[PDB]
Short mmCIF file of C-alpha atoms in Angstrom, two decimals:
data_model
loop_
_atom_site.label_atom_id
_atom_site.label_comp_id
_atom_site.label_asym_id
_atom_site.label_seq_id
_atom_site.Cartn_x
_atom_site.Cartn_y
_atom_site.Cartn_z
CA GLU M 1 5.77 -29.79 6.52
CA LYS M 2 4.69 -25.89 5.88
CA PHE M 3 3.80 -23.26 3.46
CA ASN M 4 2.87 -24.10 0.02
CA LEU M 5 2.97 -21.60 -2.74
CA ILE M 6 0.59 -23.13 -4.62
CA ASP M 7 -1.70 -22.37 -1.74
CA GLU M 8 -0.65 -19.37 0.72
CA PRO M 9 -0.93 -15.61 -0.26
CA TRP M 10 2.43 -15.06 -1.70
CA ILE M 11 2.04 -13.34 -4.77
CA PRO M 12 1.24 -9.90 -4.71
CA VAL M 13 -0.92 -9.12 -7.64
CA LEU M 14 -3.30 -5.97 -8.01
CA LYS M 15 -7.69 -6.72 -8.35
CA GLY M 16 -9.62 -3.74 -8.45
CA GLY M 17 -7.06 -1.09 -7.78
CA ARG M 18 -6.15 -2.90 -4.70
CA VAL M 19 -2.65 -4.60 -3.83
CA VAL M 20 -3.93 -8.23 -2.69
CA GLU M 21 -1.72 -11.29 -2.32
CA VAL M 22 -2.17 -14.94 -4.08
CA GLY M 23 -1.19 -18.23 -4.11
CA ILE M 24 -0.37 -20.05 -7.87
CA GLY M 25 -3.18 -21.50 -8.20
CA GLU M 26 -5.73 -18.59 -7.84
CA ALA M 27 -3.05 -16.46 -10.46
CA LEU M 28 -3.30 -18.99 -12.89
CA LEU M 29 -6.81 -20.33 -12.75
CA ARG M 30 -8.13 -16.59 -12.80
CA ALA M 31 -5.24 -14.58 -14.36
CA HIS M 32 -8.12 -12.65 -16.00
CA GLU M 33 -9.79 -10.99 -12.31
CA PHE M 34 -5.70 -9.05 -11.69
CA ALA M 35 -4.83 -6.22 -13.84
CA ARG M 36 -0.94 -7.51 -12.54
CA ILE M 37 1.34 -8.67 -10.17
CA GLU M 38 1.84 -5.53 -8.87
CA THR M 39 5.31 -5.07 -6.57
CA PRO M 40 7.67 -2.33 -6.03
CA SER M 41 10.64 -4.70 -6.84
CA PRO M 42 11.04 -5.49 -10.84
CA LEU M 43 13.46 -8.51 -10.18
CA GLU M 44 9.80 -9.85 -8.35
CA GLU M 45 7.81 -8.80 -10.74
CA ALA M 46 10.25 -10.61 -13.30
CA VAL M 47 10.68 -13.79 -11.33
CA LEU M 48 7.23 -13.96 -10.01
CA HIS M 49 6.20 -14.19 -14.22
CA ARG M 50 8.81 -16.89 -15.02
CA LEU M 51 7.92 -19.01 -12.37
CA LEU M 52 3.77 -18.81 -13.37
CA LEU M 53 5.07 -19.07 -17.48
CA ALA M 54 7.01 -22.10 -16.45
CA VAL M 55 4.16 -23.84 -14.79
CA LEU M 56 1.88 -22.93 -17.38
CA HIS M 57 4.80 -24.34 -20.02
CA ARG M 58 4.70 -27.62 -18.88
CA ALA M 59 1.13 -27.80 -17.37
CA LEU M 60 -0.51 -27.28 -21.71
CA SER M 61 2.46 -29.29 -23.13
CA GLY M 62 2.73 -26.12 -25.18
CA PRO M 63 1.37 -23.75 -26.84
CA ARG M 64 2.78 -25.99 -29.67
CA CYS M 65 1.98 -23.70 -32.03
CA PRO M 66 0.74 -19.57 -32.64
CA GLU M 67 -2.60 -20.42 -32.48
CA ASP M 68 -2.74 -22.48 -29.39
CA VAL M 69 -2.73 -19.22 -27.39
CA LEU M 70 -5.04 -17.20 -29.64
CA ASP M 71 -7.53 -19.46 -29.27
CA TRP M 72 -7.25 -18.94 -25.62
CA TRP M 73 -7.48 -15.01 -25.53
CA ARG M 74 -10.96 -15.52 -27.05
CA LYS M 75 -11.76 -17.59 -24.64
CA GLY M 76 -10.40 -15.72 -22.07
CA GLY M 77 -8.81 -18.03 -20.03
CA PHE M 78 -6.45 -20.98 -21.20
CA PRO M 79 -7.94 -24.55 -20.87
CA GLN M 80 -8.30 -25.02 -16.70
CA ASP M 81 -8.66 -28.85 -16.13
CA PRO M 82 -4.44 -29.61 -17.06
CA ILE M 83 -3.45 -26.78 -14.75
CA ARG M 84 -5.50 -28.64 -11.87
CA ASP M 85 -4.18 -31.79 -12.87
CA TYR M 86 -0.99 -30.28 -12.68
CA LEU M 87 -0.80 -28.10 -9.53
CA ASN M 88 -2.56 -31.66 -8.09
CA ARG M 89 0.36 -33.50 -9.30
CA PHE M 90 3.48 -31.94 -8.00
CA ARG M 91 1.87 -30.01 -5.37
CA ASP M 92 4.13 -31.55 -2.90
CA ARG M 93 7.22 -30.32 -4.03
CA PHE M 94 6.19 -26.55 -3.53
CA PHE M 95 5.92 -26.01 -0.05
CA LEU M 96 8.44 -23.52 1.12
CA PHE M 97 9.64 -25.81 4.43
CA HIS M 98 10.18 -29.85 3.55
CA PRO M 99 11.67 -32.26 5.33
CA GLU M 100 12.55 -33.49 1.57
CA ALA M 101 12.22 -31.44 -1.31
CA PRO M 102 11.61 -27.59 -0.28
CA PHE M 103 11.00 -25.75 -3.35
CA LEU M 104 14.00 -24.68 -4.65
CA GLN M 105 15.99 -25.26 -2.18
CA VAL M 106 18.52 -27.99 -0.98
CA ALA M 107 16.97 -30.13 2.23
CA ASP M 108 20.54 -30.94 4.10
CA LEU M 109 22.42 -27.89 3.67
CA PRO M 110 23.33 -27.32 7.69
CA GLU M 111 21.41 -24.95 10.37
CA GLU M 112 24.71 -24.36 11.76
CA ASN M 113 27.07 -21.36 10.76
CA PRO M 114 24.01 -19.86 8.70
CA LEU M 115 23.81 -16.56 6.43
CA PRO M 116 21.34 -13.72 7.30
CA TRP M 117 18.18 -13.52 4.16
CA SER M 118 19.20 -10.59 3.35
CA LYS M 119 22.03 -11.76 1.17
CA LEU M 120 19.26 -13.52 -1.21
CA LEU M 121 18.68 -10.00 -1.72
CA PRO M 122 20.26 -7.47 -4.08
CA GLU M 123 23.37 -5.16 -2.71
CA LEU M 124 22.54 -1.82 -3.14
CA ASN M 125 19.24 -4.96 12.90
CA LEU M 126 18.38 -8.41 10.89
CA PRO M 127 14.10 -7.48 10.80
CA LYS M 128 12.37 -11.30 10.12
CA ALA M 129 10.64 -11.72 7.18
CA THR M 130 7.49 -13.03 6.55
CA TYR M 131 6.77 -16.48 4.71
CA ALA M 132 5.44 -14.96 1.39
CA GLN M 133 8.98 -12.05 1.42
CA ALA M 134 11.06 -15.14 2.47
CA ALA M 135 9.12 -16.70 -1.36
CA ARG M 136 10.18 -13.98 -3.19
CA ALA M 137 13.70 -13.04 -2.31
CA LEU M 138 15.06 -16.62 -2.54
CA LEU M 139 13.31 -16.46 -6.38
CA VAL M 140 15.07 -13.46 -6.70
CA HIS M 141 18.08 -14.91 -5.83
CA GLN M 142 17.51 -18.01 -7.92
CA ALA M 143 17.42 -15.71 -11.19
CA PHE M 144 19.40 -12.78 -10.92
CA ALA M 145 22.36 -13.39 -8.22
CA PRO M 146 25.82 -12.13 -9.99
CA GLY M 147 29.06 -13.89 -10.54
CA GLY M 148 31.68 -13.76 -7.31
CA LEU M 149 33.09 -14.62 -4.18
CA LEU M 150 31.32 -17.64 -2.35
CA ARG M 151 34.07 -19.34 -0.59
CA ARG M 152 31.82 -22.43 0.80
CA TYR M 153 31.82 -25.90 0.09
CA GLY M 154 34.30 -26.43 -2.36
CA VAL M 155 33.97 -23.81 -5.21
CA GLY M 156 34.63 -20.73 -3.88
CA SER M 157 33.49 -18.13 -7.00
CA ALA M 158 30.11 -18.56 -8.20
CA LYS M 159 29.17 -18.35 -11.61
CA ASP M 160 26.40 -15.94 -12.70
CA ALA M 161 22.48 -16.87 -11.78
CA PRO M 162 21.13 -16.91 -15.63
CA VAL M 163 19.83 -13.57 -16.09
CA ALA M 164 21.88 -12.23 -13.40
CA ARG M 165 22.98 -9.67 -16.70
CA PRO M 166 20.50 -9.43 -19.87
CA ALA M 167 17.59 -6.89 -19.46
CA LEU M 168 14.57 -8.53 -19.80
CA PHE M 169 12.05 -7.73 -22.43
CA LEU M 170 7.52 -8.60 -20.86
CA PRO M 171 5.08 -7.56 -23.17
CA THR M 172 1.83 -6.82 -21.29
CA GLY M 173 -1.98 -6.47 -22.07
CA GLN M 174 -4.73 -4.96 -19.78
CA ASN M 175 -4.93 -8.25 -16.98
CA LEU M 176 -2.93 -11.15 -16.07
CA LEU M 177 -4.51 -13.40 -17.98
CA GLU M 178 -3.75 -11.59 -21.77
CA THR M 179 -0.02 -10.14 -20.14
CA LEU M 180 0.61 -14.39 -19.90
CA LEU M 181 -1.13 -15.16 -22.82
CA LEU M 182 1.73 -12.16 -24.27
CA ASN M 183 4.52 -14.15 -22.97
CA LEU M 184 4.26 -18.04 -23.56
CA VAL M 185 5.97 -18.62 -26.75
CA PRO M 186 5.64 -21.66 -28.68
CA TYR M 187 6.98 -23.97 -26.59
CA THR M 188 7.75 -27.91 -26.93
CA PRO M 189 8.55 -29.90 -23.39
CA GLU M 190 11.06 -32.72 -24.42
CA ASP M 191 14.40 -32.65 -23.03
CA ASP M 192 13.35 -29.85 -20.67
CA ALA M 193 12.15 -29.89 -17.35
CA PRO M 194 11.59 -27.00 -14.53
CA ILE M 195 13.69 -27.62 -10.95
CA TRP M 196 9.86 -29.08 -9.77
CA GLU M 197 10.13 -32.20 -12.40
CA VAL M 198 13.31 -33.59 -11.58
CA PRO M 199 14.42 -35.24 -8.06
CA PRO M 200 15.75 -32.78 -4.86
CA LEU M 201 18.80 -31.24 -4.57
CA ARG M 202 21.20 -32.68 -1.80
CA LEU M 203 24.55 -31.26 -0.77
CA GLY M 204 26.64 -33.75 -2.16
CA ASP M 205 25.55 -33.93 -5.30
CA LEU M 206 26.77 -29.71 -5.26
CA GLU M 207 29.88 -30.06 -3.31
CA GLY M 208 32.92 -28.58 -5.46
CA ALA M 209 30.77 -27.64 -8.57
CA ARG M 210 30.16 -31.58 -8.74
CA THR M 211 26.45 -30.62 -10.83
CA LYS M 212 26.84 -29.28 -14.08
CA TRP M 213 23.68 -28.52 -16.55
CA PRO M 214 24.15 -27.20 -20.26
CA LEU M 215 22.09 -23.95 -19.23
CA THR M 216 19.72 -24.75 -22.14
CA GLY M 217 15.98 -25.91 -21.17
CA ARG M 218 13.68 -23.47 -21.68
CA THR M 219 11.77 -24.46 -17.97
CA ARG M 220 15.22 -25.37 -16.50
CA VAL M 221 15.91 -22.21 -16.67
CA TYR M 222 12.96 -20.16 -16.04
CA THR M 223 13.89 -22.44 -12.63
CA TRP M 224 17.50 -22.32 -12.77
CA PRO M 225 18.83 -23.50 -9.17
CA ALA M 226 21.72 -20.55 -9.40
CA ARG M 227 22.76 -21.12 -5.80
CA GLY M 228 22.11 -23.95 -2.70
CA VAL M 229 20.37 -22.36 -0.09
CA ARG M 230 18.19 -23.45 2.73
CA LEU M 231 15.21 -20.89 4.72
CA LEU M 232 15.15 -21.80 8.29
CA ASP M 233 11.52 -21.63 9.47
CA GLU M 234 12.30 -18.91 12.91
CA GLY M 235 8.41 -20.08 13.85
CA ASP M 236 5.98 -17.76 12.20
CA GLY M 237 9.38 -15.84 9.98
CA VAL M 238 12.78 -16.48 8.40
CA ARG M 239 15.56 -14.59 9.56
CA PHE M 240 18.57 -17.03 8.46
CA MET M 241 19.16 -19.65 6.27
CA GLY M 242 21.73 -22.17 4.97
CA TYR M 243 23.59 -21.38 1.65
CA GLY M 244 26.31 -23.22 -1.04
CA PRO M 245 26.58 -23.94 -5.07
CA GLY M 246 23.97 -24.68 -7.43
CA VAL M 247 24.38 -26.20 -10.28
CA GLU M 248 27.34 -24.55 -13.13
CA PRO M 249 25.52 -24.02 -15.80
CA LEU M 250 27.81 -25.13 -19.24
CA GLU M 251 27.72 -22.79 -22.49
CA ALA M 252 25.26 -24.49 -24.93
CA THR M 253 22.59 -21.84 -27.50
CA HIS M 254 20.25 -21.12 -26.38
CA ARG M 255 18.46 -17.82 -25.44
CA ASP M 256 15.70 -17.23 -22.70
CA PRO M 257 12.77 -15.82 -24.59
CA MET M 258 12.80 -12.61 -22.96
CA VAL M 259 16.09 -11.95 -23.96
CA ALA M 260 17.32 -9.35 -26.94
CA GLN M 261 20.35 -9.33 -28.99
CA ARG M 262 22.55 -6.89 -30.68
CA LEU M 263 26.08 -6.48 -32.49
CA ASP M 264 28.94 -4.83 -30.92
CA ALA M 265 31.19 -2.41 -32.46
CA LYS M 266 33.70 -5.99 -33.31
CA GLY M 267 30.32 -7.89 -34.89
CA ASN M 268 30.10 -10.01 -31.71
CA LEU M 269 26.34 -10.97 -30.49
CA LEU M 270 25.82 -9.29 -27.44
CA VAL M 271 22.88 -9.38 -24.53
CA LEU M 272 21.15 -6.49 -24.37
CA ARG M 273 21.67 -4.66 -21.17
CA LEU M 274 20.75 -1.66 -19.00
CA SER M 275 23.31 0.61 -17.85
CA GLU M 276 23.00 4.37 -16.47
CA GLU M 277 24.89 6.24 -19.34
CA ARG M 278 23.28 5.10 -21.89
CA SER M 279 19.42 4.95 -21.81
CA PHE M 280 17.53 1.53 -23.40
CA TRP M 281 16.29 2.35 -26.41
CA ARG M 282 18.79 3.67 -28.35
CA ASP M 283 19.53 -0.24 -28.79
CA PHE M 284 15.96 -0.56 -30.24
CA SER M 285 17.28 -0.56 -34.26
CA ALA M 286 20.68 -2.52 -33.38
CA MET M 287 18.39 -5.63 -31.50
CA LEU M 288 16.50 -5.79 -35.53
CA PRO M 289 17.29 -8.38 -37.49
CA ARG M 290 17.71 -5.80 -40.55
CA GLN M 291 20.89 -4.56 -38.77
CA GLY M 292 22.07 -8.51 -37.77
CA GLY M 293 20.55 -8.33 -34.47
CA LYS M 294 18.10 -10.51 -32.73
CA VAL M 295 14.96 -9.52 -30.95
CA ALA M 296 13.51 -10.93 -27.86
CA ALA M 297 11.49 -13.94 -28.48
CA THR M 298 8.80 -12.85 -25.94
CA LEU M 299 8.39 -9.31 -27.89
CA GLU M 300 8.65 -11.16 -31.68
CA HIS M 301 5.88 -13.16 -30.14
CA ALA M 302 3.67 -10.56 -29.27
CA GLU M 303 3.68 -8.26 -32.55
CA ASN M 304 2.69 -11.34 -34.10
CA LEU M 305 -0.47 -11.71 -31.26
CA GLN M 306 -1.03 -7.93 -31.93
CA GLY M 307 -1.81 -8.71 -35.75
CA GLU M 308 -3.73 -11.66 -35.74
CA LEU M 309 -5.61 -9.49 -32.65
CA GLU M 310 -6.52 -6.35 -35.16
CA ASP M 311 -7.64 -8.62 -37.73
CA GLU M 312 -10.35 -10.63 -36.09
CA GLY M 313 -11.35 -6.83 -34.81
CA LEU M 314 -9.62 -7.95 -31.16
CA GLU M 315 -7.94 -4.80 -29.43
CA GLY M 316 -4.26 -4.01 -30.01
CA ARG M 317 -3.84 -2.64 -25.85
CA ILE M 318 -0.58 -4.42 -25.40
CA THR M 319 2.28 -2.52 -23.81
CA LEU M 320 6.45 -3.61 -23.43
CA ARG M 321 7.60 -3.60 -19.91
CA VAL M 322 11.66 -4.17 -19.82
CA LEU M 323 12.84 -5.20 -16.11
CA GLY M 324 16.61 -5.61 -14.81
CA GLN M 325 20.09 -5.27 -13.08
CA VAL M 326 22.08 -2.55 -14.46
CA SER M 327 25.55 -4.20 -12.77
CA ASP M 328 29.62 -4.49 -13.22
CA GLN M 329 31.29 -7.59 -11.43
CA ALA M 330 29.68 -9.08 -8.43
CA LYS M 331 28.49 -5.63 -7.64
CA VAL M 332 24.29 -4.80 -8.49
CA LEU M 333 23.88 -0.63 -9.10
CA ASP M 334 20.37 -0.67 -9.70
CA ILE M 335 17.33 -1.87 -10.59
CA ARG M 336 14.74 -0.73 -12.93
CA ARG M 337 11.62 -0.67 -14.94
CA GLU M 338 11.00 1.07 -18.10
CA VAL M 339 7.65 1.02 -20.21
CA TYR M 340 7.17 1.44 -23.97
CA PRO M 341 4.62 1.35 -26.44
CA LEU M 342 4.40 -1.60 -28.10
CA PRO M 343 2.95 -0.32 -31.70
CA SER M 344 1.11 -2.54 -34.60
CA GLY M 345 2.57 -3.55 -37.12
CA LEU M 346 6.56 -2.92 -35.11
CA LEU M 347 8.51 -5.67 -37.12
CA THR M 348 7.00 -4.33 -40.56
CA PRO M 349 9.39 -2.60 -42.85
CA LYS M 350 7.64 0.37 -43.04
CA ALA M 351 8.13 1.12 -39.24
CA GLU M 352 11.75 -0.91 -39.43
CA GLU M 353 13.47 2.12 -41.45
CA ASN M 354 11.36 4.75 -40.29
CA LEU M 355 13.25 3.68 -36.65
CA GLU M 356 16.49 3.30 -38.42
CA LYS M 357 16.42 6.65 -39.37
CA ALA M 358 15.36 8.10 -35.91
CA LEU M 359 17.90 6.66 -34.20
CA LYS M 360 20.56 7.16 -36.61
CA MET M 361 19.56 10.87 -36.85
CA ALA M 362 19.50 10.74 -33.08
CA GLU M 363 23.38 9.08 -32.52
CA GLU M 364 24.45 11.69 -35.32
CA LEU M 365 23.15 14.83 -33.20
CA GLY M 366 24.45 13.31 -30.15
CA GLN M 367 27.96 12.72 -31.04
CA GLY M 368 27.94 15.95 -32.99
CA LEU M 369 26.98 17.47 -29.36
CA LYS M 370 29.04 15.06 -27.49
CA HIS M 371 32.48 16.94 -29.41
CA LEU M 372 30.54 20.67 -28.97
CA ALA M 373 31.12 19.64 -25.13
CA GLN M 374 34.42 18.27 -26.05
CA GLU M 375 35.74 21.73 -27.40
CA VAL M 376 34.47 23.42 -25.28
CA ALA M 377 36.12 22.35 -22.30
CA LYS M 378 39.29 22.68 -24.36
CA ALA M 379 38.49 25.97 -23.99
CA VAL M 380 37.59 26.48 -20.76
CA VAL M 381 41.18 25.55 -19.47
CA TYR M 382 44.77 17.87 -16.77
CA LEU M 383 42.39 15.50 -18.58
CA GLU M 384 41.53 15.26 -14.81
CA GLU M 385 39.98 19.05 -15.26
CA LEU M 386 38.59 17.76 -18.96
CA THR M 387 37.14 15.38 -18.24
CA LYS M 388 35.90 16.86 -14.40
CA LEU M 389 33.89 19.87 -16.93
CA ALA M 390 32.92 16.94 -19.61
CA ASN M 391 30.29 15.65 -16.93
CA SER M 392 30.08 18.90 -15.14
CA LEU M 393 28.18 20.15 -18.57
CA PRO M 394 24.30 19.19 -19.20
CA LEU M 395 24.93 19.14 -22.93
CA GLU M 396 25.11 15.63 -23.48
CA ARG M 397 22.80 14.11 -20.08
CA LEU M 398 19.96 17.44 -21.08
CA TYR M 399 19.35 16.54 -24.84
CA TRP M 400 19.08 12.66 -24.12
CA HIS M 401 16.93 13.09 -21.13
CA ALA M 402 14.00 15.37 -23.27
CA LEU M 403 14.55 12.60 -25.66
CA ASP M 404 14.02 9.87 -22.93
CA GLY M 405 10.56 12.02 -22.35
CA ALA M 406 9.31 12.19 -25.97
CA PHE M 407 11.03 8.49 -27.78
CA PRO M 408 7.50 6.70 -25.97
CA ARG M 409 5.23 9.27 -28.27
CA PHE M 410 7.28 8.31 -31.33
CA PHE M 411 7.40 5.16 -30.96
CA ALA M 412 3.69 4.32 -30.30
CA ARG M 413 2.77 6.28 -34.02
CA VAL M 414 6.14 4.67 -35.48
CA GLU M 415 4.81 3.05 -38.77
CA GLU M 416 3.01 6.67 -40.20
CA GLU M 417 5.51 8.01 -41.90
CA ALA M 418 4.61 11.28 -40.99
CA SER M 419 6.19 10.76 -37.91
CA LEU M 420 9.84 11.19 -38.06
CA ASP M 421 9.26 14.31 -38.82
CA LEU M 422 7.45 14.88 -35.40
CA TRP M 423 10.62 12.74 -34.65
CA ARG M 424 13.36 15.46 -36.31
CA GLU M 425 11.41 18.34 -34.22
CA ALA M 426 11.52 16.60 -31.00
CA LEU M 427 15.60 16.17 -31.74
CA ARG M 428 15.96 20.58 -32.70
CA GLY M 429 13.97 21.26 -29.07
CA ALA M 430 15.73 18.79 -26.91
CA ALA M 431 18.89 20.50 -28.30
CA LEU M 432 18.14 23.80 -28.26
CA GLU M 433 16.65 23.51 -24.67
CA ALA M 434 20.01 21.15 -23.02
CA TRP M 435 22.26 24.74 -25.39
CA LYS M 436 20.51 26.94 -23.55
CA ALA M 437 21.14 24.65 -20.09
CA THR M 438 24.76 24.72 -21.04
CA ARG M 439 25.09 28.83 -22.32
CA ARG M 440 23.54 29.64 -18.43
CA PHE M 441 26.61 27.51 -16.87
CA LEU M 442 29.23 29.56 -19.19
CA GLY M 443 27.23 32.98 -18.78
CA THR M 444 28.25 33.54 -15.53
CA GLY M 445 31.89 34.30 -14.58
CA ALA M 446 34.06 35.68 -17.19
CA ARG M 447 36.46 33.24 -18.29
CA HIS M 448 33.81 30.66 -19.56
CA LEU M 449 33.40 33.16 -22.15
CA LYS M 450 35.84 32.58 -25.06
CA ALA M 451 34.33 28.44 -25.19
CA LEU M 452 30.61 30.55 -25.15
CA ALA M 453 30.63 32.32 -28.87
CA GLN M 454 32.91 29.39 -30.00
CA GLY M 455 30.48 26.81 -28.58
CA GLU M 456 27.77 29.09 -30.26
CA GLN M 457 29.60 28.31 -33.48
CA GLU M 458 29.52 25.39 -33.74
CA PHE M 459 25.99 24.44 -32.38
CA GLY M 460 24.82 26.18 -35.62
CA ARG M 461 27.04 24.25 -37.84
CA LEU M 462 25.10 21.09 -36.04
CA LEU M 463 21.43 22.54 -36.46
CA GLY M 464 21.29 23.12 -40.33
CA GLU M 465 22.09 19.96 -40.69
CA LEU M 466 19.29 17.81 -40.24
CA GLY M 467 16.63 21.15 -40.63
#
């Protein structure tokens, strides 16, 4: 019917320092001409990559082995004919509006009593979305929608979209081709199918949580129908939509290639999550095997490929992006993008031993500073005021904040054993700077002073440990 996502411009890409919008076809067939997918929403960036990856995996029936992807990097593009043959064949499943099979939507959701399209967006008068915006918001909702209250068509309480919670690891090259190659983890198509390879979903199938699937196909999970949606064409835009239950995810053993894991205190594997009291890079030693963690398959694929690129004289110009939501329950507190170098030989025991040391020191000094802040607040004065004064002190905040700036430079040089020492100095520098700010806080009013004397005692004590 209208607006084919393979053809029409809707994926924002950077071409020659300029943002332009392209379809899937151009984004895939001519990937080398774009530096990256360029969008303000890290959630959009994430799903736009996942969709393309889904399409490549199926059109190439692979990559079957690491070697395939290494071969295509050399040629400077991937097999082009099988992309076209695939896009031709499933073309009619890629219209945003369609009387039987609209993309990621439910055809027979009803027009009356619609919800606004703004409901697809994360919750941190109503404008008309362009078709391109409607398409992107749909994609983000289906990947990132948190579980909670639905109370529609017999379900009541909806489940998490598959990628609602975890931080997503996305290696990036210097153009889109390389970035896609760096995320094309070896794949086998058997017993996996993306949403457009399976018959369109209908309201009858979805009422009362009737359609349940194992949460276990890579491309099935990349394109999982987490909610029933039906965008309504206003003429030249979208404001309203039908809205209902999607497919219920049943528990299966499967980890999304972009998801990493770590042991918690009690010794259970959790997914690395973004959070605002804790810098993300503090989980980078925990996600490794030597501490019982699992590293994101994408990061693993890329580091190995970086090895095989170096040994052939090819580049190791690879950055890691982390995308995702910070959230509690049905609420989304924040959306973040974080950038890190992807250092050569990161999964070598020399670099991993250096990494464990560098975080252990940081957590060790940090908990010391945390306890210093605890004693100081007790000297200044129920747990009302003690925890109120706790955060009021800039000691821990400034300390971790300064290491945010310092961690990238350490992390790129992580294969050196001459790095551990520059790091040891960064810690001193960050502690000194944070303590100075706390001395500014304590020397301004005469009653904050019995805290300051004894605080300085323990601060000097702490600096003697590592140095």
